[PDB]
Design a protein around this ligand. Structure first.
Ligand SMILES: O=C(N[C@@H](COc1ccc2[nH]c(=O)[nH]c2c1)c1ccccc1)c1cccn(Cc2ccc(F)c(F)c2)c1=O
Length: 277
């Protein structure tokens, strides 16, 4: 049974959807956690506060090596506290910024872990809706840990959530999001690992939505050819035609794409990740 003073609170790690996430070390153990802090004053009708407003949440307990996990809960007079996994190596976006772009072996390995993670998440009937490199964290061992910041939803129009660069055309034009929306976001992320920047770029968010809906993007000359082929099979306007979706026979043909030829799917979490250089 813990409380605020078993901990030293340190740097802010993230924010959003009514809460702050703070690095904290447990004094007895020296162990480090990311503590989501939520002010009780925020818990009202006009607000959708994540994880608290939900009758049923099966996300709270999500427990898989490629996702952030919940370790403990406690409260004080004004706030609630949720002890989450701390991903010591920060955001994948930070490595894309540091090294400019990833080589093919690193793109293949990290893309396969995101695919693996998605397969699991979608098999649990959950969709993320805001998948992007800022939400793909790296633990101390350099494996991914995906985080939700309030957009993930159990499948039982849809809320206008997400980040403009990664949002699907079906969310924009049909108000709908499905498993296949996170597969569109996976195509933007693969592009961004290879090219160094995401594929839909424009002067403002409205202009970026216009490029998404028209499929206006291009590949640099050096983009790895099998990766270009995979991205072309994910960035398809018709959501029922993306590789990986149920109507395309599911995750088997996505994992069987030539870009993943030397991948061993079964044990990615037990493989030593390639050095990022
Ligand atoms: O509470 C969970 N996530 C937090 C964010 O947690 C963070 C944020 C940054 C950090 N940096 C770091 O090192 N550790 C950090 C932890 C949240 C905040 C605000 C609203 C909603 C959620 C949270 C609680 C339980 C499980 N998961 C993982 C998850 C659930 C559903 C999904 F679809 C999914 F893809 C993943 C959480 O993200």
């Amino acid at each position: 049974k813990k409380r605020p003073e078993d901990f030293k609170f340190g740097k802010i790690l993230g924010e959003g959807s009514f809460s702050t996430v703070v690095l904290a070390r447990e004094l007895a153990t020296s162990r480090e956690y990311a503590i989501k802090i939520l002010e009780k004053r925020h818990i009202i009708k006009e607000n959708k506060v994540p994880y608290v407003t939900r009758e049923r949440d099966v996300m709270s307990r999500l427990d898989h090596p490629f996702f952030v996990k919940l370790y403990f809960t406690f409260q004080d007079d004004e706030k609630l506290y949720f002890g989450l996994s701390y991903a010591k190596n920060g955001e994948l976006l930070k490595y894309i910024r540091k090294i400019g772009s990833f080589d093919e072996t690193c793109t293949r390995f990290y893309t396969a872990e995101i695919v693996s993670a998605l397969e699991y998440l979608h098999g649990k009937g959950i969709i993320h809706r805001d998948l992007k490199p800022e939400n793909i964290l790296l633990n101390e061992d350099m494996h991914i840990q995906i985080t939700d910041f309030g957009t993930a939803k159990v499948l039982s129009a849809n809320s206008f959530v997400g980040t403009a660069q990664y949002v699907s055309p079906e969310l924009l034009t049909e108000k709908s999001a499905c498993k296949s929306s996170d597969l569109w976001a996976l195509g933007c992320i693969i592009y961004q690992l290879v090219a160094g920047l995401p594929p839909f770029r424009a002067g403002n968010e409205y202009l970026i939505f216009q490029k998404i809906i028209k499929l206006e993007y291009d590949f640099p000359a050096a983009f790895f050819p099998k990766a270009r082929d995979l991205v072309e099979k994910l960035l398809v306007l018709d959501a029922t035609k993306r590789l990986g979706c149920e109507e395309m026979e599911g995750y088997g043909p996505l994992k069987a794409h030539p870009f993943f030829e030397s991948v061993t799917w079964e044990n990615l979490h037990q493989q030593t990740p390639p050095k990022l250089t």
